[PDB]
Each structure stands twice: as structure tokens, then as C-alpha cells.
Amino acid sequence: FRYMPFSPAGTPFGFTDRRYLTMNEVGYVSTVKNSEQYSITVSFFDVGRFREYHFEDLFGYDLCFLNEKGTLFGQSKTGQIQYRPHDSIHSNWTKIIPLQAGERITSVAATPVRVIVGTSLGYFRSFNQFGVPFAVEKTSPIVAL
Amino acid sequence: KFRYMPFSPAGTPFGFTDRRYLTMNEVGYVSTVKNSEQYSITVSFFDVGRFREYHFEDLFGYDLCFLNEKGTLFGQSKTGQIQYRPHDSIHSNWTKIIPLQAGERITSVAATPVRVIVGTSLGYFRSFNQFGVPFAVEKTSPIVALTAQNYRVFSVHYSQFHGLSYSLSELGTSSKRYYKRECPLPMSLPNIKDANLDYYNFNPMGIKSLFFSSYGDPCIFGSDNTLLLLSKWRSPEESKWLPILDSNMEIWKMSGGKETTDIHVWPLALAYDTLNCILVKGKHIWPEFPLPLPSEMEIRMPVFVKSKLLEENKEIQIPVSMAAEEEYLRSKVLSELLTDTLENDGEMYGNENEVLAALNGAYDKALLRLFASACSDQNVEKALSLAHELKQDRALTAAVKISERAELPSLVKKINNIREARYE
Amino acid sequence: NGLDQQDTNNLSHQEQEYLKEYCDLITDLKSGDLVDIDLSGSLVPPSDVFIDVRVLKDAGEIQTEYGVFNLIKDSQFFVRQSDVERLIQQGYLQKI
Amino acid sequence: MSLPAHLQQTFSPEEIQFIVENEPIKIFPRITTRQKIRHTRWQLITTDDKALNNMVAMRSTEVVLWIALLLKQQSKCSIVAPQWLTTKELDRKIQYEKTHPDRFSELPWNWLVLARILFNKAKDDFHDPIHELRGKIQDLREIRQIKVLKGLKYLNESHLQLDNLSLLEINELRPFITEIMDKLREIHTASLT
Amino acid sequence: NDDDNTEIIKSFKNFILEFRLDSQFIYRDQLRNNILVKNYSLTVNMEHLIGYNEDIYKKLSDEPSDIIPLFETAITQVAKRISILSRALNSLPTFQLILNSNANQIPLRDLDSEHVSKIVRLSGIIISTSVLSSRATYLSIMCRNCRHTTSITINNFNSNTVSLPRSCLSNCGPDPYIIIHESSKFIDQQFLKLQ
Amino acid sequence: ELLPYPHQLMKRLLNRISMQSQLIENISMGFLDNESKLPLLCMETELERLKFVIRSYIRCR
Amino acid sequence: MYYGISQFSEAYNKILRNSSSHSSCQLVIFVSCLNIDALCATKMLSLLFKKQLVQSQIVPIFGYSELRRHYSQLDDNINSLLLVGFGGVIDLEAFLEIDPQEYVIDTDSGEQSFRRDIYVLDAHRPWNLDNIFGSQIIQCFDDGTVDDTLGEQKEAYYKLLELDRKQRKKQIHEYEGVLEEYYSQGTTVVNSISAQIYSLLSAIGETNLSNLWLNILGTTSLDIAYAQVYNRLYPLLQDEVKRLTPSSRNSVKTPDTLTLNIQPDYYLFLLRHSSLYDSFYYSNYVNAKLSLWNENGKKRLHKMFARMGIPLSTAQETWLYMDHSIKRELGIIFDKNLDRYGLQDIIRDGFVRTLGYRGSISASEFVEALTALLEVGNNSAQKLTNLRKRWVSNFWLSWDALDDRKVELLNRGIQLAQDLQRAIFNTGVAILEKKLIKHLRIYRLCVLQDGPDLDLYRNPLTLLRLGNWLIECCAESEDKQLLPMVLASIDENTDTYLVAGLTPRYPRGLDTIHTKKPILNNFSMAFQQITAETDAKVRIDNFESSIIEIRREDLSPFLEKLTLSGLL
Ligand SMILES: [Zn+2]
């Protein structure tokens, strides 16, 4: 099986130079590839709840998860995980997950209680919203999370 | 598709040499050599005081052999013959032959002081008493391997239709009952350089060995060479498999950046504190007749990052932060497992409570180091979360000391509030 | 005398009683305290307590602490080190 | 007599062997001295028998050397080679010694005696082929002797220092070295008023 | 074959360095002895050589005349390796080999026209001893008009003697290399007569 | 030059030697009445080693 | 069936628990002098005991009355006494004259505990049941092979025990007849003691390479006496070797490495460590095949050597000094030539072991050296006691030589073997040219009166070796049938004749069915009969019945009685 990474309600880059990483009720993240960097337009369906912001991304985090506690950006191949609170009253902490040989992050998950990482080799990573890894588990390849 | 070649726990393939090991266990190691007419069975023991070697012959050339503290088994898949010998051998050895269809093969065989286990590539499953009486014949999915203890028995089934499934059975003295029934098995089959192919010719599933630890919980060792550990199998719903070993990563630590393919490992058993296992300096992914001394390896999770440790190098340098991460995770998992063992079965040798308490102290020290790291991060939320994980009042005083050393008083007073919360 | 020119002709009287009283003093050191260790104990570090020894000369049975032992000419005997040492002192044993 | 002159001058090689026997060492048991919760204790004043009461066959255990040798004579003990004893460490030490003719390498002083005893008994448990280990340690001994010889060119009446010399070699060298050194000291004192 | 000869030299040094009994490498023992008392000479038993490796002994027996100088060179290299610090001609005199056979002794009488240039074992009584006669281990020469000076290291293992150098050898003449008998290094030889 | 005599040290050592000796005596007599007698021999070997060291020290002094 | 084969381990454990006293020795070892297999078994026991740290005393004995007087010397506390291959057939209990009631502690249910328990492993075949079963103090290790076959004899003996009427009288008489059937039979050996000892070790699982090596040596020692037994045990030994072969293949030889091989062996004494010519020269089988005793034997030897095309001077020079270029090719050369001479049966596979760079030594060479060291390692009855002491000393020397470090002593035994083979050859050719053999068609008779080395010859093993050589010579002369071999030697110091009665033996390679049935030494029964009545003051104290010491003057009436004796 090819096991390409998946983001909920994502849109393939395809022919378009721009795409949606993830379409969420809290907000829809539209983003463009600049061919050297990945411009991100982090658009929110409720601007009053969370004012719209948009920052250029040099990394090009392949998988993005956003929810009212915070927006999470992860690059599947690199394994580095970037977090930004939607309230943004907390710091935008960034960490990197350990990667096995050829291991890639299939799915991304963000929760106020915990942070969960979905990878190719089926590893389950329990992290807190602050980036502390609460637990690590291995199961069947988690395509979707 | 699948060859369904029979597998014995950590058995050594026949190889170029005529001599070969059949099954590696903490109780003892068994090898054999064909005398040009038949194979020479030797039953060697790691503990001489427990048992004394008896080596003999069989024209059968039994394909597989099982052994345990009470008795030993010898199975020939093609002929379906099964030979039993009590290890004390005061009782007469008895030998039977199982029925089987045309071309049927017995993948593995297991023995327990309560029942005798028969498992074939056809998936047919037979239960026998210690004396040769069959308890029952029953139909199962084909099994790659078998895991037997005194009464704890673990069954793992494979079918290219069914994938990998596994069931845990607690037979006890009587009233057999299964903790799990054919749970899907998370494990990475080797991908389809000569040695691994030869091993697949011996064991296509590529699992090196499968056994119970020093405390009897399951221990799956496969082609990944990174053994997985089953957590809280006493609770069925709560039970889950956790990564417990990073073999290749530990080698990179040992190699110091120069990965070597000659390194191959076979854990005859798992001590709860650290893995006891044996290594090879050679192309063979199987041990050799001159038996090397197994080397005890510390159990560690593969949370380490290759790039980060490479930066640390530029004998492997480990960040105190990342090492602290790994060790408190180890403390958490080991403490949970040890406590659960004390629950279902209690103390195996009495020393469990105090080593558990020392483990708790080490975990608290880890938490306080993480608190110092959070203070370096200068983030109140991280320190508060660490305070939640702290489980000692004096550890809370230590956190107060760390916070005042970091000079932020808000964290100090939050830790204080946590202290009054913990008092009652 | 401590490990067990026997003739005193090579020796004058004065020094004869000197050496006799010196041996008596050595026994006194053995006497009372320090009796646990042999004051003239072997200065070689002990290698192995149990060793097999062939009888150098036939001298019949000699009583050990607990085991009967007959000194039959040229007979191997694998026992503790104290007895074999003390018989080496008389030389009735050999070859280690 | 009370003490032979040769004995008081220097420690005999057998005394060195005894001292090394007093050292602890890592071993593997072949007996589970632990008793199931489901006999006779060793009760040693010189060494904690609690460990001795606690061996389990094929587990990590550290014991004093001489009891380890005693049990290794029996089939019930398995010995663990030291890390410096590993051939890679030996090669590194050889390369260091060749690199630094001035000084020696930080070998564990008893390493010579350890190598002797293990070659005598632990020949089986060496993962590395034993003969190569013998050759390498022989070469290291030769190099250490040669480095000593250049030091002999620099013998002084004031101060003599030996950073990393083994206990065996310093013991065998002490009589002659002390005689020469004290003779030089006496000569100088006579020269002084 | 010169590389092959060097390989054979390496094989012989592997012999001497890794031939031991009861962990005791007697060869390095006598080596360090001959270092302490500077006798550049080495004693070896061919029975030991056969035990370690028949093949080297057989190669010896085939033509000892030229095998021996290679062995001497090997012993000299070994002494340089051992008794001299790493990275620390005629600096170290070559060691010379001593051998004990213990084979049969053909009588002096009835010696064959065969056995020419062959190692043999005999016994007899000396009737005369010669005075010492030096032998040019190393030879120092200069090319006369060409002024080219060169080194020669002739062994006493041929036949009779090596003729003097001819031509310029980098006209200078049929023997430009006039021997300057100062740098040249000599070793004494003595002639014996057995009844 | 002779060193001071740590009298307390050696008297405690002597007490230890004694108590070990009576302990070995009790084990021996009980045997005259576990299957593996090796720990007793380890005790005896320890006793012999320490007594040998003490003898060496006394003779040197 | 006093001791079952499997029950050997049980008996061993019983001996352990009886003598489980590290403080006090409760075990004594009694061994027959002048037996290689006995020495191998004693080494086995010594290693086993040092594994168990059990205190024990080891004593070598040569005489039966010596055994009795030593037993009198022995303390009663010793609960463990082992006997190695001597006296099993003779009723030792009757020879010991013991009272079990004295020995039994707590007869009561019934158990038999004795303060001395004597365990007897015997190589002799007749295996007296009363010796086996008369006393429980007499503990006999039973191969089973004789015992099950003795089931009819054992039940007859049991019936005799029960009955102590005409029908019962004739039944008892028939049982007695059966006794005499297995009586009057020349004792032999079918089990190399080392073989069942190593079997017991395997039962305990303590076998190492050395144990198997020493078992090989003991069996090789047995080979000459009983070739067929050696051949039968040979595949078992090879299989055990395979069981214990190291995994490493064709590794470069290094001093630490020790290897034992199963490679073709040639029936030439000391072949590796001696020359070729000499190895042929004193080879008894080679001599008998080629009649080397006569000058034509030498002529044929030169002819065959030239047939191989081996240069003479090369042949008389030692095998080790031979160039390997020819040494490798030797085997095929013999294959091409021995058959042409009929000498091909001499080639056979054997066990040759090497360590480091010392060299490879044949087990046959090893046993030859051991025998040599036994033979010549070092009033009249007092002089005979002195010879017994010296023979015990040679036994201890051979014991010591078995240790690896005494390679020098092994070479000394090698030299002694060369010398003894030379002297035996000289004596044999001397008697053959002089036709000193005088066959009386009941037994071929030769006697030793003149010539040197009679002091060497009166040593029993030397006489035995000469007897083996002459038996080989006679057997290879198929023109004359097998007849009993009687040999008598004089010692002027004792002034009395020394006699050994050697049973006839088939030539080696004789696989015919009539040669399959072994010969029983009628000499022993004749000697016992003579001792019973009209005895000529012979000595039978020696553990070998065939070897007998007689007054030189009284030997002539002994021969007259032997002619009178019909059992010969
Ligand atoms: Zn020129």
C-alpha cells in the first residue's frame, strides 16, 4: 500500500499552486506553495472568536490540524510538529517526532487534553497540548485519525 | 503467498553446518546435528542445578522441540509425530503422532504443566494432557508461533485472509479462560540480503522469537528486532501493545554512527528491568553452536531522534532532556506494569515493593528534572502540568525550589496551591 | 620447630638454649591469643583448598579432623588443604 | 624467620594474585540462589552475601573475584569479560601507546593479572578469539617495557613518577628501582654538608 | 615474485610472532633476550615451524639458500617493530638465524653427488679452525667519474661472490663504483674442517 | 618504619574471625547429624584468606 | 540385573549421598594395575569427583590378596569403594569373606545399609551371579547384555537358592550343569570400561571432548584383545564425536585450538612420530603378513617399498621429517600397492587428535606410549613386592602422562614403546629362527630360558605383547590351525618360571562366521584345576588368570598335567 499522508477535509496540490490543508468548522486553512516556501492563509470561519491570521511557512508542514485550543502544523516526511494556539495567548511551541526508517506521518490530531500523532508505521504518540509526550504506542498503520 | 514454514522460538535454521539449534528458552537451549542418518537431540540447560543434560537420538529428526520446567516436547511436522519427555524424567516419556491431512504441517508446539498444545499450519488445534490423553481437538486460524508458561498461554494466529491475529489464554490449574481472543496483531512483516531470505525459508513470518518476560507478560520479537511489550493484559479492554525496544537505535548508540549489519539478536527471555539477549558478530541472523554469553540490554523506547542525536555527536551523546524523557517514560510504564503484577499475582520474590518505591523516586526525580527544563522554557503551563504528574509532597517542595531558582513566583504559588490540594 | 642442622654440635651451648627459649617464645605467641591463626602459617597465598595428593611414603593411617586417611604408598587423595599442608611439613606427601 | 628478606622487599606475584582475587567482578550465575516465595546462606564478613543469596541463573551479578573463580571451576558460574579486555579497546590502547611514547595508557593496574587468570580459566567465555587477545596483551606488555627503558635513561635522584604503570610491573620493578634511587639519594646526601 | 617474496617474509614473521606454547611466545622471548644482550642472532626449531605451518618449512627445504636471507630480513623487521618505538640501513644490524634439526645425520663418508645446496645434518670432529674473515654485509661505492655513490647489501647465501657493479647504473666504465671501505659494514667468517 | 597498631580494628577482626569459626563449627556439626555444601566452603576459603593476610601482617610487624 | 544401564545414574547418586561429606572422605578407589581402560576410567572418576568436590583416595592394585589385605587396612566408615574390571567373575564376597549382618544397618519393609559399600564394575564376561547377587554389599554394574542372556542361568541360580525328591534333585542337577556350561569358559571382555563409564557420564550429561577422547583411548587399548568389540563400538564413538565436534570448520590452526579428527589410520605403530620403514618393521600384523622375522621378509619389504617407489633413505627417515608433497599422496599409493600385496586391510579410519602446533597423535600411538610407560616406567616375594611397587609407580607415571602438560613424558613413553617393540621383535625373530616354539598339538609351547631382557620379559605386559606378536605370526600362517599359546619365562633373581596362557586369536580382518565366534581362554580353567589339586605352587594373586608365576623346577610336571588336561 502506498500510504500517503491524509489531512481531514484536505485538498491535493494537484495542478493548483494553492490548496486547503484542512477544512474545519473552526476555520478553513487555505495555503499556497511559493516554490521555495509554503504560504499559509490560516482562515477562520469565526473571525470574532479567532481573528484571521496568516504566516508564511518555510518548512511546508504537510499535515495541519486546527481546533479552538490551537492550530497544529506537521510535515509528514520531516517529522517536526508545529503548534500555534488559536487564542495564541500561549506560545507557539514546536517539536519533532522520532521517525523510523522511512516512517512518515499519515495523520495529524490536536486536542485540548492531548496531542496525537498518526504515522505510517502505526505508532501512536500521546502528547499534551504543550508538547509533552504523555505516552507512545504502536499499532497497525494509522491511515486516518 | 505464504510458505507456512514451521517456527520455533528463536530456533536456529539448519544452515550450512549440520548442527543447529531448535528452540531457545531461559529454561535451556536445545540443538541437534544429523549423524548422516538421524539428528542428535541434546537437551542443554542454562541452570545446571535445575536439570542435567540428557542427549539422545531420534531417527524421526523431529522438526521442532518444546521444553519447560516440567517436560519437553519434540514435534515432526511432516510426520505429525510428537514426543514428550518429562524434564525430571522420573515419569516415563510418552510419544504420540497427531492426525493430519495430506501435506499438513505443524507450525509450532507448546507444553504446559496443565495441558499440551498442538498447532498446525492447517490451523487445527489439539489439547492434550501431560500424560498423552487428548483434552480436545478444535479448529483455529493457522498460528505462526506459540507462547506457553506454567499456566499462561499465548496464541497468535495468521491467515493471509485474516492477517495477524492473537489470543491470550489463562488456563490455570483448571477452568481455562482467555484474556484475549484473536486480537489483530500489530507487527511489521519483513519486506520481500541472503541471510534474511534463508531465515524466511526457515521462518517466513520473520519473527525472531516470542515468549513471556520474567514476569510472564508477552514479548513479541520480530524482523523489526524491536520487541513490543503488552501492557495490562489482565484487563482485556485496557490491554495494549507498547513499543519497548529500539534495537537498531541502541546499536547506533553502540556503533557510534557506523551501522553494522552483522549485529543480530535473539532474546531467550526478558527480565523486567532489562532485556537479556544474545548478539552475533557475523553475517548469520542465527546464533552458532559454540554458545556465546547473552548480553543484558537495557530496555528503551524508540523516542530518540536520529537527527537530534547526530547533532549531539557533532559513545553517542544524549541530551539530558531527551534522556530524561526516555527514562521517565520507562519509569511510568515499568511502575504501572509492576503495580499491576502486584495486583493480579502479588510479589514474586518480596523485593518488588521496595524496587517499585525506588522506581517511583526515580520517576519523581525525572519529573523534577523536567520541571527544571520547563523553567528554562519559562512557561507556567508546562511547570503546572509537571506538578500534576508529580506524586510526592516533598517532590512538590522540590518543584517549589526549582521555581524559586527560576525566580518566577507565580509558579511557586501554583505549586503551593497544588500542595494544599494534595494534602487532602 | 615453627613449620613442625638438627644436630647442635655446630652450635654452642649459650646459643643452644637461646634458640630453645626462642622456640618457647614462639609457642607462647601461638599460645593464648592469636591461636586461631598459625604464627608460622604458610606465607604463600592459598590457591585451592581441595587438591589431590599422592602419598610419598607409606606410613599407615593418620587421623584427620573428620575423615579417615591411610597413607598407603603412592595413593591419590583429594581433600582439604590443611591436612595436606601439615603432612607436607613432615613430607609424607608429595607432588602437590 | 619472621619474614624472608625477599618477601619484605616486594610483594610476591602470588600476593598480587591474592589482591586481585579480592577485587569484585561481573559474572553470570547458573544457579538461582533466590528461593521461590511459592537452605544455607553464604554469610561472608568480607563480602555482602545478600547478593550471594540473590543470584539467578543467567542474570547480572557482581561478586568478588576469588569466589567467582571458585564457582567457575565448578559448572555453576559464568564469568563476564571486562570492557577494556575487549579487542577493540585493546587496539585503541595499542594505538594510543604508539601515539604517545612519552607516557602510558590508563590501564586497570590489575589488568595483567586479570588477563593471566582469565586465560587460565575463562578461556571459554571470551567472545573474541583468545589467542589474538594473548598476542595483543603481550604486545602491550612489550611496549610498556620499552617505554620503561627510555624512562631508565631519565632516572633521577630527586623524583620518579609513573602515571599509568600496572601493579604487576611496578611490583617487579620496585626492588631494583628503589635500590638505585636510594643509592643516588645517599650519594647526594654524602655530597651535601 | 618480489611481492610474493615479501608475502613469504610476512608469513614467516606471522610464524615467529604467533607461535606460542602455553601462552608463551618463546621466539619473542629470545628476541628480547638478544636485545638486552645485543647478539643479533635468533634460534628456531624446524619442528616448531612444521607444527605451525608445514608449507613454510617445505618452501625452506626447497631452496634454503635464498629462503634464509628472507628470514633474516623478517627477523630484522620484527626487531624493528618490537624493540623500536613506532615513528621514532645499518642503524640496526641484521639478526642471523640459528636452527636445530634433530633429523638423521648422513655420515660425512658416503655423501652423495646429490644433496647439492640442500640442508643437511651431520657430525664430526674439528681438526682445524680458521682465523676470522670479515664479510661485506653492506658495501659503499662511488661511480668514479660519474661520482654516483650507491649502497650494496650482499648476503653470504649464493654459490662464487657477486661481481663488482658494471656500467654507470645512473661511459663511467665497466666498474665505476669504486668501493670506499669506510661506510661498508663487515662481519667476520671462520672456516672449519671436520674429520 | 613500623606503623601504629589499630588495636580496635584488629580486635574487631579477631571477634569476626572467632564468630565465623564457631559458625563454621555449627555448620559442620549439623552436617554430621542443605545439599549444596559449597557456601560453607566459600566461608572456609574466606576465613583462610583473611587468616593468611593477618599472618602476613603479624609476621611483617 | 543388579545395576541397570539407566540405573547407573541412580547408583551414582546413591554413592554421592552416601559419601556427601566434604569434611570427611568416605570414598576409596581400587583399580587394577596394568590396564589402560582402567586408567581411563579412573581419570573419568577423578574428573567427576573434582566436579563434585568429593573427597576420595585412589589406590592402584595388582594382586587379589593385595586387595584383601588393603580391605583389611580400610576403615569401615568408607561407604564408597570402586573396583575397575577386576575380580568380577570370581566371587569377591567369598574372596572377601564378609558378613552382611555385620554390615547391614537398619535391615528394616527391608533396606540394606552398610558402612562400607563396594561398587564393582567388571570387564570380565563370565559374571558370576552369586558374585552379582549373593551380597547386596557387592554392587555390580551390569551391561545388561550378559545379564538378560543370563536370564536362564539367573533363574537356575535362583532355583538353586530356593532349594537348599528325585524330580527336584534332578532339576537342581540340571541347573548345576547349566552353571558348568557358563563355567569352564575362558573369560573375555565385550565392553571397554571407558565405554560404559562415558555412557554413565552422558546419562549425567557431563561428557566433554576429553571424556570421549579417553573413551576412545580405552577402546583402542581393547582393540588388540578384541578387535570385533572395537569395531562394533567404533560407529558409536564416531557418532559421539559428531555430537561433540566444534561447529567451526577448517579454521586456521592456532595454539589455543585443539581438534580431534576421524581420518584413515594405518596399522603401523608410532607412524607419525616414527619413520616409515621402522613403522612397518616392528608392526606385528605387517611382520606376520610378510614373515619379516625371516630374511625373505626383509626382501619382500624392500620389494614392496620399491613398489611404492619410495626411496629407501627417505623411508627409514621419520614421517614428521618427510616432505608433505609425498606425505599427502601416501594413502592412495598404499591403496594402489597394499592390495597388490594383499596388505590393504591395514588401512582403516582412526581417531587422531592434535593441539595447537604440537602435532597430531594417533590414539593407537597414545595407547602404545601408555603401555610402554607402564612396562618400563621404573626375599623373592619381597623382590616381587618391590616389582609390584615399581609397577604401581609406572601406573602413576602413565596416569600423569595422560595430563596434557606432560607432553615430554608422553614422548618418553613413545621412546619406551620404540625400544620395547625393537626388543620384542629381536626376541621373536630369535625364537623363530631357532624354532624355540614346540607345539604339542594341544598347545604351541615356547619357553624363555636364555637371552637378555628376561627381567623386562617377566614384567607381565612385555610377555603379553610378545605373545600378541607371536599369535599374530601364527595366525597369519593359516597353514597351521589355531592352537592354544603357552609361554614361560625365567627370572634368575626369583629362579622360578613366569607363565602366561594366551588363547588363540584369529587374524585381523577375519570377518568369517567361524571367526565371528570368539575363543575362550581354556588356560585359566587349566590353571584353576591345577591349583585345585597337585598344585605346583603357582601364583594367581595377579588380576590376570592366564599369567601365572611358577617354580621353574615345578613347571615340567605342570606341562605334564597340561598334556593330561583335556580342557586345553
Ligand atoms: Zn656513473
PDB file of C-alpha atoms and ligand atoms in Angstrom, chain E residues 142-148 167-173 176-177, ligand 1:
ATOM      1  CA  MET E 142      81.086   5.587  -5.812  1.00  0.00           C
ATOM      2  CA  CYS E 143      80.739   5.772  -9.608  1.00  0.00           C
ATOM      3  CA  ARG E 144      84.251   7.236 -10.174  1.00  0.00           C
ATOM      4  CA  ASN E 145      83.819   9.865 -12.932  1.00  0.00           C
ATOM      5  CA  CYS E 146      80.032   9.835 -12.594  1.00  0.00           C
ATOM      6  CA  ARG E 147      80.521  10.470  -8.834  1.00  0.00           C
ATOM      7  CA  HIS E 148      77.324   8.486  -8.201  1.00  0.00           C
ATOM      8  CA  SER E 167      78.359   0.426 -16.114  1.00  0.00           C
ATOM      9  CA  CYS E 168      77.239   3.782 -14.730  1.00  0.00           C
ATOM     10  CA  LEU E 169      73.974   2.459 -13.238  1.00  0.00           C
ATOM     11  CA  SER E 170      72.859   6.099 -13.000  1.00  0.00           C
ATOM     12  CA  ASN E 171      80.595   5.762 -20.093  1.00  0.00           C
ATOM     13  CA  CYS E 172      81.581   5.561 -16.427  1.00  0.00           C
ATOM     14  CA  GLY E 173      83.314   2.246 -17.149  1.00  0.00           C
ATOM     15  CA  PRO E 176      82.894   2.844 -11.977  1.00  0.00           C
ATOM     16  CA  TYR E 177      81.580   2.089  -8.483  1.00  0.00           C
TER      17      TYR E 177
HETATM   18 ZN    ZN H   1      78.085   6.957 -13.490  1.00  0.00          ZN
END
